[PDB]
Structure formats: structure tokens, C-alpha cells
Amino acid sequence: GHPTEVLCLMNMVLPEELLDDEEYEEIVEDVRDECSKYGLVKSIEIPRPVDGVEVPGCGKIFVEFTSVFDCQKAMQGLTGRKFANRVVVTKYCDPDSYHRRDFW
């Protein structure tokens, strides 16, 4: 709906793929590098799974840009792009919710 400077990338990761530090770090770098083609990436949040503990937003990628315009360019460039034989699905994330790490 309402465009923000925070992009949420869905359908890109399985929780299993975020357990090992090396794999998690590689996903963070790959995400940053792809998003950097559209604007300045201020920060990234990829909630990691903890088996038996609820982790809201796990399986989702949150990328904060330095402007709303750069985020909208990222949403245009990434939405519908094929990744891991799937379809990248997106949404805007509330900036306040992002900073207080209140994901869904």
C-alpha cells in the first residue's frame, strides 16, 4: 500500500537455510548486493530461526533504503523476479516497526 523506505522480500528463503552462520552471512551479502543496484542500503534484517522459540518475520528479508524512491525502484526491480526457482513477492514495511524489530 503506502510506500516506505523499508522493503520486505518474501518467498526467497527457507528457515533451514538461515541456521548455519556461513550460509546466513552469504544470504545477507547476496541480498545487499542485489538491492544495492537500486539504492543505498541503510540496513538489513533477516530474522533467524530458533527451534521451539517463536521468531516473527522468519522466512522474510527486510531491507531499509536511504529514501522512499530508492525503495520503490527496488520493489519495481525485484518483484516477480525468479529466485531459488520461486517468485519474489514483496511489500512495504512500516519504518517504526522495522527499527523496534516488530516483524510479522
Side-chain angles (χ1 to χ4, degrees):
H2 168 73
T4 71
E5 69 265 34
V6 190
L7 190 58
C8 175
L9 300 161
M10 302 167 285
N11 212 20
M12 283 165 73
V13 286
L14 290 177
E16 304 97 79
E17 307 171 3
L18 303 170
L19 291 157
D20 308 318
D21 292 342
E22 280 195 281
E23 202 178 357
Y24 175 75
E25 259 75 86
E26 196 186 348
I27 290 152
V28 170
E29 294 174 45
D30 284 7
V31 150
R32 188 176 54 236
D33 295 351
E34 203 53 50
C35 292
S36 290
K37 299 180 179 175
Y38 305 103
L40 286 64
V41 169
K42 188 150 154 89
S43 64
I44 299 163
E45 287 304 328
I46 309 181
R48 297 183 64 164
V50 179
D51 263 40
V53 186
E54 200 223 325
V55 177
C58 190
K60 285 176 182 68
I61 296 158
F62 303 86
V63 187
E64 180 196 23
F65 295 87
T66 57
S67 73
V68 170
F69 180 61
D70 287 1
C71 187
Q72 293 196 276
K73 283 156 88 181
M75 188 180 177
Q76 184 185 143
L78 298 163
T79 306
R81 267 186 75 193
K82 194 217 107 288
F83 185 84
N85 203 37
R86 320 187 253 251
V87 194
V88 176
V89 163
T90 62
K91 66 181 183 207
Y92 302 109
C93 176
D94 184 287
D96 304 305
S97 312
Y98 174 79
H99 294 312
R100 69 176 63 102
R101 302 165 87 97
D102 182 62
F103 312 112
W104 301 90

XYZ file of all heavy atoms in Angstrom:
836
model
N 0.809 -1.214 0.000
C 0.000 0.000 0.000
C 0.842 1.263 0.000
O 1.425 1.622 -1.031
N 0.914 1.941 1.170
C 1.680 3.175 1.395
C 3.205 2.904 1.278
O 3.753 2.158 2.105
C 1.325 3.776 2.772
C 2.239 4.873 3.222
N 2.195 6.137 2.649
C 3.198 4.859 4.175
C 3.121 6.846 3.274
N 3.748 6.120 4.203
N 3.900 3.509 0.269
C 5.350 3.252 0.098
C 6.227 3.870 1.187
O 6.051 5.041 1.544
C 5.669 3.868 -1.272
C 4.328 4.084 -1.931
C 3.401 4.390 -0.805
N 7.157 3.056 1.726
C 8.118 3.451 2.762
C 9.516 3.202 2.225
O 9.663 2.703 1.111
C 7.891 2.697 4.104
O 8.266 1.328 3.945
C 6.470 2.816 4.643
N 10.546 3.520 3.030
C 11.949 3.277 2.687
C 12.355 1.822 3.067
O 13.492 1.433 2.816
C 12.867 4.314 3.373
C 12.973 4.170 4.890
C 12.048 5.018 5.750
O 10.894 5.270 5.333
O 12.475 5.407 6.862
N 11.435 1.036 3.680
C 11.715 -0.356 4.082
C 10.936 -1.324 3.182
O 9.711 -1.238 3.065
C 11.453 -0.658 5.582
C 11.994 -2.045 5.954
C 12.061 0.419 6.481
N 11.679 -2.229 2.539
C 11.145 -3.263 1.653
C 11.170 -4.620 2.333
O 12.195 -5.006 2.909
C 11.981 -3.340 0.349
C 11.405 -4.214 -0.795
C 9.984 -3.743 -1.243
C 12.365 -4.253 -1.980
N 10.078 -5.369 2.206
C 10.033 -6.729 2.703
C 10.038 -7.696 1.528
O 9.114 -7.665 0.718
C 8.832 -6.971 3.608
S 8.674 -8.701 4.130
N 11.058 -8.565 1.461
C 11.217 -9.578 0.414
C 10.762 -10.948 0.936
O 11.301 -11.450 1.924
C 12.681 -9.622 -0.057
C 13.257 -8.335 -0.659
C 14.787 -8.362 -0.632
C 12.795 -8.153 -2.088
N 9.731 -11.527 0.290
C 9.166 -12.813 0.697
C 9.359 -13.879 -0.393
O 9.612 -13.532 -1.537
C 7.679 -12.654 1.073
C 7.454 -11.650 2.200
S 5.751 -11.112 2.489
C 5.513 -10.024 1.159
N 9.287 -15.177 -0.007
C 9.430 -16.376 -0.863
C 10.863 -16.637 -1.292
O 11.081 -17.424 -2.209
C 8.553 -16.261 -2.118
C 8.010 -17.545 -2.660
O 7.941 -18.541 -1.978
N 7.451 -17.490 -3.853
N 11.849 -16.014 -0.630
C 13.237 -16.147 -1.044
C 14.066 -17.120 -0.224
O 15.091 -17.592 -0.719
C 13.903 -14.783 -0.994
C 13.517 -13.928 -2.151
S 13.946 -12.225 -1.855
C 15.672 -12.250 -2.018
N 13.675 -17.386 1.028
C 14.473 -18.237 1.903
C 13.625 -19.235 2.643
O 12.481 -18.946 2.985
C 15.307 -17.392 2.932
C 16.504 -16.700 2.283
C 14.440 -16.395 3.722
N 14.213 -20.380 2.967
C 13.625 -21.371 3.873
C 14.308 -21.202 5.234
O 15.526 -20.978 5.237
C 13.806 -22.806 3.356
C 12.998 -23.205 2.133
C 13.346 -24.606 1.711
C 11.509 -23.167 2.409
N 13.578 -21.266 6.385
C 14.240 -21.107 7.707
C 15.512 -21.947 7.878
O 16.452 -21.492 8.517
C 13.170 -21.584 8.695
C 11.900 -21.271 8.023
C 12.121 -21.455 6.532
N 15.518 -23.180 7.319
C 16.608 -24.159 7.354
C 17.915 -23.557 6.820
O 18.985 -23.790 7.392
C 16.212 -25.418 6.535
C 14.911 -26.077 6.990
C 13.660 -25.704 6.211
O 13.490 -26.263 5.104
O 12.805 -24.950 6.736
N 17.799 -22.734 5.760
C 18.902 -22.052 5.077
C 19.529 -20.938 5.940
O 20.606 -20.436 5.601
C 18.414 -21.461 3.730
C 17.713 -22.464 2.815
C 17.021 -21.932 1.568
O 17.100 -20.712 1.297
O 16.397 -22.750 0.855
N 18.887 -20.576 7.066
C 19.407 -19.499 7.917
C 20.043 -20.002 9.216
O 20.456 -19.176 10.033
C 18.285 -18.487 8.258
C 17.538 -17.808 7.104
C 16.331 -17.061 7.622
C 18.459 -16.910 6.276
N 20.146 -21.325 9.407
C 20.675 -21.884 10.655
C 22.195 -21.764 10.750
O 22.694 -21.379 11.814
C 20.228 -23.344 10.864
C 18.734 -23.552 11.167
C 18.319 -24.927 10.814
C 18.394 -23.296 12.634
N 22.917 -22.077 9.647
C 24.372 -22.016 9.636
C 24.833 -20.591 9.314
O 24.365 -19.968 8.353
C 24.960 -23.062 8.673
C 24.425 -24.468 8.929
O 24.309 -24.857 10.115
O 24.075 -25.155 7.949
N 25.724 -20.075 10.176
C 26.288 -18.723 10.137
C 26.872 -18.367 8.773
O 26.612 -17.271 8.292
C 27.363 -18.539 11.233
C 26.850 -18.541 12.672
O 25.630 -18.338 12.876
O 27.674 -18.738 13.595
N 27.638 -19.293 8.157
C 28.249 -19.106 6.841
C 27.188 -18.898 5.774
O 27.297 -17.961 4.972
C 29.144 -20.306 6.484
C 30.512 -20.251 7.143
C 31.529 -21.197 6.535
O 31.478 -22.403 6.864
O 32.362 -20.738 5.717
N 26.138 -19.745 5.795
C 25.034 -19.670 4.848
C 24.246 -18.372 5.066
O 23.917 -17.691 4.095
C 24.129 -20.895 4.989
C 23.294 -21.164 3.735
C 22.394 -22.381 3.721
O 22.409 -23.149 4.711
O 21.631 -22.528 2.738
N 23.968 -18.031 6.339
C 23.215 -16.832 6.693
C 23.949 -15.580 6.220
O 23.328 -14.709 5.633
C 22.953 -16.778 8.208
C 22.282 -15.507 8.663
C 20.930 -15.289 8.425
C 23.009 -14.502 9.303
C 20.310 -14.108 8.817
C 22.400 -13.310 9.691
C 21.043 -13.130 9.467
O 20.404 -11.998 9.897
N 25.269 -15.505 6.482
C 26.129 -14.390 6.086
C 26.165 -14.234 4.565
O 26.141 -13.107 4.081
C 27.546 -14.584 6.645
C 27.837 -13.753 7.885
C 27.211 -14.211 9.187
O 27.815 -15.068 9.872
O 26.145 -13.664 9.554
N 26.192 -15.352 3.814
C 26.197 -15.349 2.349
C 24.885 -14.793 1.815
O 24.913 -14.027 0.862
C 26.445 -16.758 1.805
C 26.841 -16.779 0.338
C 26.955 -18.151 -0.301
O 26.953 -19.162 0.441
O 27.080 -18.215 -1.546
N 23.738 -15.154 2.438
C 22.414 -14.671 2.030
C 22.341 -13.149 2.258
O 21.896 -12.442 1.373
C 21.265 -15.443 2.747
C 21.172 -16.901 2.227
C 19.901 -14.718 2.598
C 20.603 -17.897 3.236
N 22.795 -12.660 3.427
C 22.829 -11.227 3.770
C 23.613 -10.444 2.676
O 23.082 -9.474 2.134
C 23.418 -10.977 5.192
C 23.683 -9.496 5.445
C 22.511 -11.548 6.285
N 24.837 -10.903 2.335
C 25.694 -10.292 1.315
C 25.025 -10.301 -0.056
O 25.046 -9.280 -0.742
C 27.043 -11.009 1.221
C 27.944 -10.889 2.442
C 29.199 -11.741 2.351
O 29.840 -11.733 1.275
O 29.532 -12.429 3.343
N 24.411 -11.449 -0.441
C 23.738 -11.583 -1.729
C 22.561 -10.635 -1.859
O 22.376 -10.042 -2.931
C 23.292 -13.021 -1.959
C 24.431 -13.951 -2.336
O 25.607 -13.510 -2.297
O 24.155 -15.122 -2.652
N 21.765 -10.497 -0.767
C 20.613 -9.597 -0.691
C 21.089 -8.129 -0.862
O 20.576 -7.413 -1.735
C 19.856 -9.828 0.633
C 19.160 -8.561 1.132
C 18.869 -10.973 0.484
N 22.104 -7.723 -0.056
C 22.684 -6.393 -0.060
C 23.155 -6.026 -1.449
O 22.820 -4.950 -1.929
C 23.837 -6.287 0.947
C 24.361 -4.853 1.126
C 25.433 -4.689 2.168
N 26.531 -5.601 1.915
C 26.989 -6.479 2.787
N 26.432 -6.581 3.992
N 27.989 -7.284 2.459
N 23.904 -6.927 -2.101
C 24.469 -6.708 -3.425
C 23.359 -6.511 -4.458
O 23.411 -5.545 -5.221
C 25.405 -7.865 -3.806
C 26.658 -7.997 -2.950
O 26.929 -7.078 -2.132
O 27.394 -9.004 -3.123
N 22.315 -7.349 -4.418
C 21.190 -7.208 -5.362
C 20.397 -5.900 -5.136
O 20.085 -5.197 -6.103
C 20.250 -8.425 -5.278
C 19.432 -8.641 -6.542
C 20.202 -8.712 -7.851
O 21.193 -9.477 -7.933
O 19.803 -8.003 -8.802
N 20.093 -5.574 -3.868
C 19.337 -4.362 -3.538
C 20.144 -3.082 -3.830
O 19.543 -2.086 -4.217
C 18.859 -4.394 -2.095
S 17.599 -5.651 -1.776
N 21.482 -3.124 -3.679
C 22.392 -2.006 -3.906
C 22.353 -1.474 -5.353
O 22.765 -0.346 -5.572
C 23.824 -2.380 -3.539
O 23.926 -2.511 -2.130
N 21.819 -2.262 -6.309
C 21.663 -1.892 -7.713
C 20.565 -0.835 -7.889
O 20.490 -0.215 -8.951
C 21.321 -3.142 -8.546
C 22.372 -4.251 -8.525
C 21.917 -5.421 -9.376
C 22.913 -6.545 -9.414
N 22.367 -7.713 -10.163
N 19.729 -0.611 -6.852
C 18.586 0.317 -6.879
C 18.748 1.542 -5.965
O 18.122 2.578 -6.183
C 17.296 -0.425 -6.507
C 17.062 -1.628 -7.396
C 17.318 -2.918 -6.938
C 16.668 -1.476 -8.725
C 17.170 -4.029 -7.775
C 16.510 -2.582 -9.568
C 16.743 -3.858 -9.080
O 16.593 -4.955 -9.894
N 19.565 1.400 -4.933
C 19.821 2.480 -3.999
C 20.711 2.069 -2.852
O 21.156 0.921 -2.762
N 20.973 3.022 -1.976
C 21.814 2.853 -0.804
C 21.056 2.045 0.243
O 19.953 2.415 0.650
C 22.236 4.231 -0.257
C 23.302 5.024 -1.052
C 22.813 5.421 -2.490
C 23.665 6.300 -0.319
N 21.626 0.910 0.623
C 21.047 0.035 1.632
C 21.561 0.528 2.987
O 22.767 0.468 3.269
C 21.368 -1.451 1.350
C 20.995 -2.340 2.528
C 20.677 -1.926 0.069
N 20.656 1.077 3.793
C 20.994 1.597 5.107
C 21.234 0.406 6.082
O 22.234 0.391 6.815
C 19.869 2.532 5.567
C 20.166 3.305 6.839
C 19.451 4.638 6.814
C 19.184 5.153 8.209
N 20.306 5.974 8.737
N 20.337 -0.608 6.044
C 20.424 -1.805 6.885
C 19.596 -2.936 6.317
O 18.825 -2.748 5.367
C 20.002 -1.515 8.329
O 18.641 -1.141 8.426
N 19.825 -4.133 6.854
C 19.132 -5.374 6.503
C 18.833 -6.123 7.813
O 19.641 -6.115 8.747
C 19.937 -6.265 5.496
C 20.185 -5.553 4.165
C 19.250 -7.609 5.220
C 21.266 -6.195 3.352
N 17.659 -6.750 7.862
C 17.211 -7.624 8.932
C 16.656 -8.890 8.310
O 15.739 -8.849 7.483
C 16.159 -6.953 9.840
C 16.697 -5.885 10.783
C 17.813 -6.285 11.732
O 17.851 -7.460 12.172
O 18.642 -5.403 12.058
N 17.276 -10.010 8.644
C 16.852 -11.335 8.216
C 16.660 -12.136 9.513
O 17.640 -12.659 10.050
C 17.778 -12.047 7.174
C 18.097 -11.132 5.952
C 17.127 -13.381 6.727
C 19.001 -11.743 4.845
N 15.420 -12.170 10.082
C 15.200 -12.911 11.341
C 15.593 -14.384 11.187
O 15.272 -15.019 10.175
C 13.697 -12.710 11.617
C 13.360 -11.456 10.873
C 14.158 -11.564 9.610
N 16.441 -14.858 12.121
C 16.989 -16.219 12.105
C 16.156 -17.146 12.972
O 15.709 -16.726 14.040
C 18.448 -16.231 12.583
C 19.361 -15.454 11.704
C 20.796 -15.562 12.187
N 21.293 -16.937 12.101
C 22.575 -17.279 12.168
N 23.510 -16.350 12.335
N 22.932 -18.553 12.081
N 15.968 -18.419 12.549
C 15.145 -19.339 13.351
C 15.853 -19.852 14.597
O 17.066 -19.971 14.611
C 14.865 -20.489 12.381
C 16.056 -20.502 11.453
C 16.490 -19.076 11.328
N 15.073 -20.116 15.652
C 15.458 -20.709 16.932
C 14.368 -21.745 17.184
O 13.218 -21.385 17.439
C 15.648 -19.679 18.101
C 16.020 -20.381 19.404
C 16.692 -18.618 17.763
N 14.689 -23.020 16.977
C 13.702 -24.087 17.069
C 13.023 -24.145 18.447
O 13.692 -24.255 19.473
C 14.329 -25.449 16.706
C 14.079 -25.859 15.260
O 14.142 -24.971 14.361
O 13.804 -27.061 15.024
N 11.695 -24.011 18.428
C 10.848 -24.046 19.615
C 10.525 -22.688 20.198
O 9.694 -22.575 21.102
N 11.195 -21.655 19.677
C 11.006 -20.258 20.059
C 10.425 -19.532 18.846
O 10.889 -19.720 17.715
C 12.282 -19.566 20.614
C 11.960 -18.165 21.115
C 12.913 -20.379 21.746
N 9.384 -18.731 19.080
C 8.736 -18.005 18.013
C 9.618 -16.836 17.550
O 10.059 -16.009 18.354
C 7.350 -17.528 18.458
C 6.461 -17.196 17.262
C 5.636 -15.931 17.380
O 5.174 -15.598 18.497
O 5.410 -15.294 16.330
N 9.883 -16.783 16.243
C 10.675 -15.702 15.672
C 9.820 -15.026 14.587
O 9.749 -15.531 13.468
C 12.062 -16.152 15.146
C 12.815 -14.976 14.494
C 12.906 -16.811 16.239
N 9.111 -13.921 14.917
C 8.271 -13.268 13.897
C 9.102 -12.713 12.749
O 10.162 -12.113 12.956
C 7.563 -12.151 14.678
C 7.695 -12.527 16.156
C 9.039 -13.213 16.214
N 8.630 -12.948 11.533
C 9.311 -12.468 10.338
C 10.319 -13.432 9.755
O 10.946 -13.114 8.753
N 10.491 -14.610 10.363
C 11.441 -15.598 9.878
C 10.928 -16.182 8.561
O 9.755 -16.533 8.447
C 11.694 -16.674 10.928
S 13.064 -17.774 10.513
N 11.803 -16.202 7.566
C 11.488 -16.579 6.194
C 11.332 -15.340 5.326
O 11.151 -15.443 4.109
N 11.389 -14.151 5.960
C 11.290 -12.834 5.317
C 12.615 -12.054 5.415
O 13.411 -12.242 6.343
C 10.159 -12.003 5.942
C 8.768 -12.436 5.524
C 7.731 -11.634 6.270
C 6.309 -12.050 5.939
N 6.012 -13.413 6.444
N 12.835 -11.182 4.434
C 14.012 -10.337 4.336
C 13.548 -8.865 4.367
O 12.700 -8.464 3.582
C 14.855 -10.693 3.068
C 15.407 -12.131 3.153
C 16.012 -9.668 2.852
C 15.778 -12.793 1.841
N 14.102 -8.076 5.292
C 13.742 -6.667 5.424
C 14.939 -5.800 5.077
O 16.008 -5.960 5.657
C 13.195 -6.354 6.822
C 12.007 -7.199 7.208
C 12.181 -8.451 7.793
C 10.712 -6.738 7.003
C 11.080 -9.235 8.141
C 9.617 -7.523 7.358
C 9.808 -8.770 7.916
N 14.774 -4.927 4.077
C 15.864 -4.070 3.592
C 15.449 -2.614 3.707
O 14.432 -2.203 3.132
C 16.280 -4.421 2.138
C 17.521 -3.631 1.718
C 16.507 -5.922 1.955
N 16.234 -1.839 4.456
C 15.979 -0.416 4.644
C 16.855 0.389 3.691
O 18.081 0.246 3.725
C 16.231 -0.017 6.106
C 15.975 1.457 6.372
C 16.553 2.003 7.664
O 17.519 1.412 8.193
O 16.069 3.063 8.115
N 16.229 1.237 2.845
C 16.945 2.114 1.912
C 17.046 3.520 2.527
O 16.373 3.784 3.526
C 16.232 2.139 0.524
C 16.264 0.798 -0.181
C 15.278 -0.166 0.061
C 17.294 0.483 -1.053
C 15.318 -1.409 -0.567
C 17.325 -0.748 -1.703
C 16.344 -1.701 -1.433
N 17.873 4.412 1.946
C 18.034 5.781 2.455
C 16.918 6.721 1.980
O 16.840 7.837 2.473
C 19.411 6.378 2.095
O 19.592 6.342 0.683
C 20.569 5.677 2.808
N 16.066 6.284 1.036
C 14.939 7.072 0.560
C 13.778 6.163 0.160
O 13.987 4.980 -0.106
C 15.352 7.989 -0.593
O 15.588 7.317 -1.815
N 12.559 6.727 0.099
C 11.338 6.010 -0.326
C 11.450 5.682 -1.830
O 11.093 4.580 -2.243
C 10.048 6.818 0.001
C 8.797 6.216 -0.657
C 9.863 6.953 1.509
N 11.995 6.623 -2.617
C 12.188 6.494 -4.060
C 13.094 5.308 -4.409
O 12.783 4.562 -5.342
C 12.736 7.802 -4.661
C 12.973 7.754 -6.162
C 11.927 7.507 -7.048
C 14.225 8.012 -6.688
C 12.148 7.470 -8.432
C 14.439 8.002 -8.073
C 13.403 7.721 -8.932
N 14.214 5.151 -3.694
C 15.123 4.029 -3.940
C 14.470 2.708 -3.599
O 14.665 1.725 -4.320
C 16.446 4.210 -3.192
C 17.283 5.288 -3.854
O 16.814 5.867 -4.856
O 18.404 5.544 -3.381
N 13.646 2.697 -2.541
C 12.888 1.519 -2.154
C 11.869 1.111 -3.240
O 11.715 -0.074 -3.534
C 12.198 1.742 -0.820
S 11.417 0.257 -0.174
N 11.174 2.082 -3.802
C 10.175 1.869 -4.854
C 10.830 1.322 -6.113
O 10.298 0.374 -6.687
C 9.395 3.144 -5.127
C 8.531 3.501 -3.928
C 7.475 4.503 -4.253
O 7.717 5.715 -4.261
N 6.274 3.997 -4.531
N 12.041 1.814 -6.450
C 12.856 1.308 -7.568
C 13.259 -0.156 -7.311
O 13.238 -0.957 -8.245
C 14.112 2.171 -7.761
C 13.812 3.498 -8.453
C 14.867 4.529 -8.115
C 16.044 4.522 -9.035
N 17.035 5.535 -8.634
N 13.599 -0.502 -6.039
C 13.938 -1.869 -5.628
C 12.700 -2.755 -5.732
O 12.782 -3.863 -6.258
C 14.495 -1.880 -4.202
N 11.544 -2.261 -5.267
C 10.299 -3.024 -5.365
C 9.965 -3.303 -6.837
O 9.583 -4.434 -7.156
C 9.123 -2.324 -4.682
C 7.885 -3.226 -4.620
S 6.454 -2.471 -3.825
C 5.254 -3.760 -4.039
N 10.170 -2.291 -7.737
C 9.921 -2.473 -9.160
C 10.901 -3.500 -9.761
O 10.467 -4.403 -10.473
C 10.012 -1.142 -9.901
C 9.658 -1.287 -11.365
C 9.851 -0.041 -12.155
O 10.261 -0.104 -13.312
N 9.392 1.088 -11.644
N 12.186 -3.374 -9.445
C 13.221 -4.263 -9.975
C 13.222 -5.695 -9.468
O 13.585 -6.593 -10.219
N 12.794 -5.936 -8.216
C 12.826 -7.268 -7.583
C 11.497 -8.064 -7.648
O 11.534 -9.293 -7.762
C 13.274 -7.142 -6.113
C 14.713 -6.556 -5.879
C 14.908 -6.088 -4.447
C 15.814 -7.567 -6.189
N 10.340 -7.391 -7.559
C 9.034 -8.065 -7.571
C 8.853 -8.852 -8.877
O 9.094 -8.323 -9.970
C 7.884 -7.068 -7.353
O 8.116 -6.315 -6.167
C 6.510 -7.745 -7.272
N 8.496 -10.130 -8.720
C 8.275 -11.049 -9.829
C 9.508 -11.739 -10.363
O 9.382 -12.641 -11.194
N 10.703 -11.311 -9.920
C 11.955 -11.913 -10.359
C 12.066 -13.291 -9.721
O 11.584 -13.511 -8.606
C 13.181 -11.009 -10.073
C 13.546 -10.119 -11.255
C 14.842 -9.341 -11.024
N 16.047 -10.163 -11.157
C 17.266 -9.802 -10.763
N 17.463 -8.630 -10.168
N 18.295 -10.620 -10.941
N 12.488 -14.248 -10.552
C 12.682 -15.644 -10.203
C 13.926 -15.747 -9.337
O 14.970 -15.184 -9.694
C 12.799 -16.510 -11.474
C 12.663 -18.010 -11.222
C 13.590 -18.833 -12.123
C 14.772 -19.426 -11.380
N 15.785 -18.403 -10.997
N 13.787 -16.430 -8.178
C 14.836 -16.664 -7.185
C 14.587 -18.002 -6.520
O 13.498 -18.210 -5.988
C 14.861 -15.530 -6.144
C 15.970 -15.587 -5.113
C 17.232 -15.072 -5.393
C 15.740 -16.115 -3.848
C 18.249 -15.107 -4.431
C 16.754 -16.139 -2.885
C 18.000 -15.636 -3.181
N 15.595 -18.911 -6.558
C 15.572 -20.275 -5.998
C 14.405 -21.095 -6.597
O 13.775 -21.891 -5.895
C 15.496 -20.232 -4.463
N 14.146 -20.890 -7.911
C 13.080 -21.491 -8.728
C 11.658 -21.059 -8.236
O 10.658 -21.690 -8.591
C 13.213 -23.029 -8.803
C 12.539 -23.640 -10.010
O 12.533 -23.074 -11.113
N 11.922 -24.793 -9.817
N 11.576 -19.939 -7.470
C 10.329 -19.393 -6.912
C 10.016 -18.001 -7.542
O 10.584 -17.673 -8.584
C 10.427 -19.310 -5.378
C 11.127 -20.515 -4.747
C 11.060 -20.499 -3.242
N 12.309 -20.165 -2.554
C 13.040 -21.036 -1.866
N 12.682 -22.313 -1.802
N 14.150 -20.642 -1.253
N 9.079 -17.221 -6.955
C 8.693 -15.886 -7.441
C 8.894 -14.906 -6.285
O 8.248 -15.113 -5.251
C 7.213 -15.839 -7.966
C 6.949 -14.580 -8.775
C 6.835 -17.081 -8.777
N 9.775 -13.858 -6.426
C 9.958 -12.876 -5.336
C 8.658 -12.069 -5.193
O 8.150 -11.507 -6.167
C 11.201 -11.968 -5.503
C 11.286 -10.908 -4.400
C 12.470 -12.810 -5.547
N 8.105 -12.091 -3.964
C 6.877 -11.427 -3.540
C 7.293 -10.354 -2.546
O 8.136 -10.621 -1.705
C 5.879 -12.462 -2.949
C 4.791 -11.788 -2.128
C 5.264 -13.327 -4.038
N 6.762 -9.126 -2.668
C 7.192 -8.018 -1.803
C 6.047 -7.248 -1.129
O 4.870 -7.415 -1.459
C 8.034 -6.997 -2.621
O 7.208 -6.453 -3.641
C 9.291 -7.596 -3.241
N 6.424 -6.375 -0.183
C 5.543 -5.412 0.477
C 6.405 -4.342 1.125
O 7.600 -4.566 1.336
C 4.558 -6.060 1.498
C 5.190 -6.694 2.732
C 4.125 -7.300 3.633
C 4.733 -7.866 4.891
N 3.926 -8.981 5.473
N 5.803 -3.189 1.439
C 6.479 -2.159 2.205
C 6.332 -2.509 3.675
O 5.327 -3.106 4.070
C 5.917 -0.767 1.907
C 6.009 -0.374 0.451
C 4.872 -0.298 -0.341
C 7.232 -0.037 -0.127
C 4.944 0.087 -1.677
C 7.318 0.347 -1.465
C 6.167 0.421 -2.230
O 6.232 0.804 -3.545
N 7.332 -2.171 4.475
C 7.322 -2.436 5.908
C 7.303 -1.089 6.629
O 7.933 -0.137 6.147
C 8.530 -3.290 6.292
S 8.710 -3.591 8.070
N 6.523 -0.975 7.731
C 6.454 0.271 8.498
C 7.841 0.531 9.086
O 8.425 -0.390 9.670
C 5.365 0.211 9.592
C 5.172 1.510 10.364
O 6.040 1.841 11.194
O 4.131 2.165 10.172
N 8.414 1.742 8.873
C 9.782 2.011 9.349
C 9.950 1.903 10.867
O 10.957 1.358 11.312
C 10.045 3.435 8.861
C 9.112 3.614 7.712
C 7.875 2.906 8.149
N 8.965 2.395 11.650
C 8.985 2.341 13.124
C 9.011 0.892 13.621
O 9.809 0.565 14.501
C 7.783 3.092 13.736
C 7.662 4.541 13.300
O 8.647 5.299 13.469
O 6.573 4.926 12.817
N 8.169 0.027 13.017
C 8.075 -1.409 13.313
C 9.399 -2.117 12.995
O 9.824 -2.995 13.743
C 6.943 -2.040 12.509
O 5.751 -1.281 12.612
N 10.054 -1.717 11.895
C 11.342 -2.247 11.467
C 12.450 -1.955 12.510
O 13.207 -2.859 12.875
C 11.715 -1.641 10.095
C 13.105 -2.011 9.636
C 13.368 -3.261 9.076
C 14.173 -1.128 9.793
C 14.653 -3.618 8.678
C 15.463 -1.477 9.402
C 15.693 -2.719 8.832
O 16.950 -3.086 8.433
N 12.548 -0.693 12.963
C 13.567 -0.247 13.908
C 13.394 -0.873 15.293
O 14.404 -1.176 15.934
C 13.597 1.282 13.989
C 14.043 1.917 12.704
N 15.175 1.478 12.036
C 13.487 2.929 11.996
C 15.271 2.234 10.955
N 14.273 3.113 10.882
N 12.140 -1.124 15.729
C 11.864 -1.767 17.026
C 11.820 -3.318 16.882
O 11.530 -4.025 17.852
C 10.574 -1.220 17.671
C 9.269 -1.605 16.970
C 8.052 -1.113 17.732
N 8.010 0.349 17.810
C 7.231 1.123 17.063
N 6.398 0.586 16.179
N 7.266 2.442 17.203
N 12.128 -3.823 15.661
C 12.217 -5.235 15.248
C 10.904 -6.004 15.497
O 10.922 -7.184 15.871
C 13.421 -5.934 15.911
C 14.746 -5.245 15.584
C 15.863 -5.679 16.503
N 16.522 -6.884 16.005
C 17.639 -6.884 15.285
N 18.235 -5.738 14.969
N 18.167 -8.027 14.872
N 9.767 -5.332 15.215
C 8.417 -5.874 15.344
C 7.923 -6.292 13.952
O 7.196 -5.551 13.284
C 7.487 -4.848 16.027
C 6.067 -5.324 16.265
O 5.887 -6.315 17.013
O 5.132 -4.682 15.737
N 8.368 -7.482 13.509
C 8.034 -8.066 12.209
C 6.843 -9.015 12.335
O 6.367 -9.265 13.448
C 9.255 -8.798 11.619
C 10.546 -8.013 11.660
C 11.596 -8.413 12.474
C 10.716 -6.877 10.870
C 12.789 -7.684 12.511
C 11.904 -6.146 10.911
C 12.934 -6.551 11.731
N 6.343 -9.529 11.204
C 5.202 -10.442 11.213
C 5.510 -11.676 10.366
O 6.015 -11.515 9.234
C 3.932 -9.729 10.719
C 3.549 -8.522 11.529
C 3.948 -7.235 11.318
C 2.710 -8.497 12.699
N 3.414 -6.408 12.281
C 2.641 -7.154 13.136
C 1.999 -9.480 13.416
C 1.884 -6.766 14.252
C 1.246 -9.094 14.519
C 1.197 -7.753 14.929
